[PDB]
Design a protein around this nucleic acid. Structure first.
Ligand SMILES: [Mg+2]
Ligand SMILES: [Mg+2]
Ligand SMILES: [Mg+2]
Ligand SMILES: [Mg+2]
Ligand SMILES: [Mg+2]
Ligand SMILES: [Mg+2]
Ligand SMILES: [Mg+2]
Ligand SMILES: [Mg+2]
Ligand SMILES: [Mg+2]
Ligand SMILES: [Mg+2]
Ligand SMILES: [Mg+2]
Ligand SMILES: [Mg+2]
Ligand SMILES: [Mg+2]
Ligand SMILES: [Mg+2]
Ligand SMILES: [Mg+2]
Lengths: 108, 87, 140, 196, 110, 151
RNA sequence: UAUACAAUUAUCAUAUUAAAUUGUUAAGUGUUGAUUUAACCAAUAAAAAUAUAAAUAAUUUUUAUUUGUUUUUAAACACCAUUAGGUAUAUGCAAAUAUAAAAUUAUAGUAAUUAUAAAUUAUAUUAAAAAGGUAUUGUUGCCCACCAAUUUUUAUAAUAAAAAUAACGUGCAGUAAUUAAUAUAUUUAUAAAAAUAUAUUUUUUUUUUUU
């Protein structure tokens, strides 16, 4: 998992306010896809699926969270459209009907 | 009317008391000065009570017993009884 | 001058004020007008006097023989209201009465919900509207 | 006479007994105050205390209504700007000023449209002040405590169900999984408060 | 409940004041309640009411010679058997035995 | 952790604040006692001495170990610093509660006297001659509002 | 010293014609790692969804019954403490605002009152416009507890309680007031008070009639 704190990009820096920002999500996703292609071609070469040329990876983008870092993330997928082909965009975002207590904030 | 201030008159208008001490006490602000308070004694049903009252009176040649009357309020908190004459 | 405002209300602000040519209702209006001038009455009081004045027995049920929704025609009202200001000596120059009473109505014709009024602001009361927003006022 | 009946020579004319003990109330309602401005408690426009009120809470969103200057604001031309953007992004060999002409036409109209909407909205402010606004004279309806009586009516009901006993009482919150962590003999779901 | 909800009259405002208490008044009385409760805690008060005894009259166990906090004041005179039993009660209240229901503990309870 | 307090201070304050600071030493924290507000240098050390001689009195009975670190005797600051013992191996190897004693006091005293005399300013503030209204309650004689006798 | 409440609408502790109680569901492994936080430290992470009708109205339940404290962590979150843990939510006990009352305080002798709400108080992104005061020429405004003396009443709990009070020393609790306050509950403690669990505005508002 390539993470905004895993890639540098986070600490000892500008601030927390901008930590979960759009452009960080973009940096992370675009850094991840770059490293994702070759390993995909290797995992396929292992079972004998060459995917030599003129092929796209059929992708399902599952998105969680309703936070700023989402927007930018998907953008870094869209500029890879010549490599990756998105069939389905479905977001899995947990909804709390009720459940165990969340951590107590300041006021309540 | 405040009926609990009269506790030591015991249903009487005036009292007879004996002099013991005379000390001074400072009134509630914004009134400054020294209020003279006489500490007196009297007996009822063979009980000896110490009464504490405001000395407004005129002392002449040395004398012992006073006549106590109740008033309205005064500068000094806690002192209900006043002095009429000294005998 | 507030007189013209009052008369505008009696003309346009009242559904079915009977037949306003008849000497009875006409005299009601005349007297009340002369009582708004010379300050003998509040405008509000004279208006509530006008609309509560005695007209004719079973008034509504005679009104069902003329009107559908109880809104009469406004010509009799304006002709009477000009007539009263002329016969009373209200203005030095005769025409001014009619002109002003007419003009103030024509300007209000363009306004949203023109012939209804909030009861508090309609007449003299403790709290008032600013002179621009007053209703039949010259400053609108 | 020459001015309002609710305002005499020295200020607002003091009717209730509150005015005679507190006659600062007659001459000062705030920093938007002038002398002609007494008895008309709302002050001019664009001015301090000029805002009209609706059931007591002032109307500060007017532009947001007609969709001038809001985040939700109405947009006149979209198809044009998108069309032109598409043109710019596609290729550089052919340049289309046809699109930029349709667009600048669109804008040229938009100006007058907007001035019209603004004017109509100021007329709305005037009308709203005349025929609707109470001039900050009635109690707020917009926060839950103002509706306390309503909630009371509901508490009362849950009390009469409980044999007219526990007012304002609610069921004890149990646990995330109270039902399946408890043994036979203990209450596994939260009961009515009277039932405890 | 046994103890007092309030101390003094906490709802004194003018009639039709649309709350039980004002902020000011409730703060005053919160102060007085605070002082009393703090006194109870630090002096280590203990009361008891025993079955088959007059109930309104409560034996004050915090004044008992064994459990007395002061080294000076004469505590109280309570029956030898009964006082032994009270001492045992206070002592075996302290700690949580498993299977028993958890009950709030404090420094001042000992 | 730094504790700053004034020059004029009650016995009371000395007591509870002493217990506080020692309880803070017990947890291994940094402890510095500072006077940045004082009438005279002599007074300032009067109080530093008071607080310290209360501190060892209390901390020896509960037996928590700390060594005296730093005395800074200065123009604007009169201060002492204590360091706790790190472990129970540190408490058993070095078992000491180590304080300054008359020599270190009096020496950094004269050093403060000279340091303050050199700058020409002997304290941040000094007491004022103002007498606030004071009731004494019961008296044997006439007394003016400030609490003084009548000649 | 004696010398005329209300009975049409009054907020703190004397309830009372009421339909509930019982339901076994969910969730869990691939692999080499900077998650959460304003900031520290411990260190597998996923999760627990269904019930209406019906019960008749009043006249002797008031020593009866009843008002959010609850076995099981070998199950978590949460909270409390800090690398060594505690706790983790209605089978014992537990009457209690929803008002029947006669000026404030005070265990029902202490001080002489108290409480209270709309006047006034310059900056919250409209084509400049909405805002609070325990102060009263008003924040350099007021106030809060402990910490000494004394005064006075008594139902004497570490060091009695309560009331008057004008020192000294800590602070800075309160006036949406430097983590909003208020009430109950439980814990904590130099001192105002602070932490958590519920209710709540005597706190300032931000507003999707199937997209
Ligand atoms: Mg009597
Ligand atoms: Mg007097
Ligand atoms: Mg204003
Ligand atoms: Mg409490
Ligand atoms: Mg009752
Ligand atoms: Mg348990
Ligand atoms: Mg005494
Ligand atoms: Mg006392
Ligand atoms: Mg504060
Ligand atoms: Mg606070
Ligand atoms: Mg605060
Ligand atoms: Mg509170
Ligand atoms: Mg504290
Ligand atoms: Mg509290
Ligand atoms: Mg709180």
């Amino acid at each position: 998992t390539y993470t905004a704190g895993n890639r540098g990009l986070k600490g000892g820096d500008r601030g927390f306010r901008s930590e979960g920002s759009t452009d960080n999500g973009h940096q992370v996703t675009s850094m991840y896809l770059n490293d994702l292609l070759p390993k995909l071609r290797e995992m396929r070469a292992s079972e004998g699926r060459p995917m030599g040329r003129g092929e796209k990876v059929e992708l399902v983008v599952r998105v969680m969270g309703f936070y700023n870092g989402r927007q930018g993330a998907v953008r870094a997928v869209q500029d890879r459209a010549n490599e990756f082909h998105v069939r389905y965009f479905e977001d899995i975002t947990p909804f709390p009907l009720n459940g165990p207590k969340m951590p107590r904030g300041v006021f309540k | 009317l405040f009926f609990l201030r009269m506790w030591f008159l015991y249903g009487c208008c005036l009292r007879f008391v004996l002099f013991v001490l005379c000390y001074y006490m400072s009134p509630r602000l914004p009134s400054s000065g020294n209020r003279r308070v006489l500490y007196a004694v009297f007996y009822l049903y063979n009980f000896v009570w110490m009464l504490r009252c405001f000395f407004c009176c005129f002392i002449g040649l040395v004398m012992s017993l006073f006549i106590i009357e109740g008033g309205g309020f005064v500068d000094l908190p806690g002192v209900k009884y006043y002095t009429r004459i000294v005998s | 001058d507030d007189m013209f405002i009052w008369l505008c209300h009696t003309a346009m602000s009242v559904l079915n004020p009977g037949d306003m040519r008849s000497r009875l209702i006409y005299n009601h209006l005349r007297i009340l007008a002369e009582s708004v001038a010379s300050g003998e009455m509040t405008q509000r009081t004279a208006f509530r006097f006008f609309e509560s004045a005695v007209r004719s027995p079973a008034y509504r049920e005679i009104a069902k023989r003329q009107l559908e929704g109880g809104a009469a025609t406004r010509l009799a009202g304006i002709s009477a209201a000009a007539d009263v200001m002329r016969r009373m000596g209200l203005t030095r120059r005769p025409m001014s009465s009619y002109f002003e009473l007419y003009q103030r109505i024509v300007e209000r014709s363009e306004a949203m919900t023109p012939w209804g009024f909030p009861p508090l602001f309609q007449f003299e009361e403790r709290l008032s509207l600013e002179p621009r927003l007053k209703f039949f006022s010259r400053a609108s | 006479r020459q001015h309002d009946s609710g305002v005499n020579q020295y200020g607002l004319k003091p009717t209730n007994a509150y005015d005679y003990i507190n006659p600062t109330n007659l001459i000062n309602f705030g920093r938007g105050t002038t002398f002609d401005n007494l008895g008309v408690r709302r002050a001019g426009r664009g001015e301090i205390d000029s805002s009209p009120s609706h059931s007591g809470s002032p109307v500060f969103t007017q532009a947001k209504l007609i969709g001038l200057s809001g985040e939700e604001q109405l947009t006149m031309c979209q198809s044009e700007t998108m069309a032109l953007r598409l043109c710019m992004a596609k290729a550089g060999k052919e340049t289309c000023e046809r699109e930029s002409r349709a667009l600048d036409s669109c804008l040229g109209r938009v100006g007058h449209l907007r001035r019209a909407m603004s004017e109509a909205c100021w007329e709305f402010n005037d009308w709203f002040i005349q025929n609707v606004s109470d001039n900050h004279t009635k109690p707020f309806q917009h926060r839950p405590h103002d509706w306390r009586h309503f909630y009371a009516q509901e508490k009362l009901v849950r009390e009469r169900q409980q044999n007219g006993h526990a007012y304002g009482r609610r069921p004890k919150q149990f646990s995330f999984g109270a039902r399946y962590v408890k043994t036979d003999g203990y209450g596994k779901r939260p009961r009515l408060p009277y039932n405890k | 409940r046994w103890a007092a909800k309030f101390y003094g009259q906490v709802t004194f405002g003018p009639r039709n004041y649309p709350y039980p208490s004002s902020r000011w008044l409730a703060r005053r009385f919160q102060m007085k309640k605070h002082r009393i409760i703090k006194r109870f805690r630090f002096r280590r008060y203990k009361l008891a009411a025993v079955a088959n005894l007059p109930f309104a009259k409560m034996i004050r166990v915090g004044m008992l010679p064994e459990l007395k906090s002061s080294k000076t004041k004469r505590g109280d005179v309570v029956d030898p058997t009964l006082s032994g039993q009270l001492v045992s009660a206070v002592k075996n209240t302290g700690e949580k035995r498993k299977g028993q229901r958890t009950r709030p503990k404090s420094k001042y309870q000992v | 952790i730094d504790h700053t307090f004034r020059d004029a201070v009650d016995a009371h304050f000395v007591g509870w604040r002493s217990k506080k600071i020692v309880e803070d030493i017990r947890r291994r924290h940094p402890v510095k006692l500072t006077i940045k507000e004082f009438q005279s240098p002599e007074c300032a050390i009067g109080k530093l001495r008071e607080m310290c001689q209360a501190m060892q009195h209390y901390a020896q009975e509960k037996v928590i170990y700390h060594h005296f670190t730093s005395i800074v005797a200065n123009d604007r600051e009169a201060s002492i610093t204590f360091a706790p013992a790190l472990p129970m191996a540190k408490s058993d190897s070095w078992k000491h509660i180590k304080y300054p004693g008359e020599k270190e006091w009096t020496n950094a005293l004269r050093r403060m006297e000279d340091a303050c005399r050199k700058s020409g300013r002997y304290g941040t503030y000094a007491k004022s001659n103002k007498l606030k209204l004071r009731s004494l309650g019961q008296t044997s004689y006439r007394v003016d509002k400030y609490g003084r006798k009548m000649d």
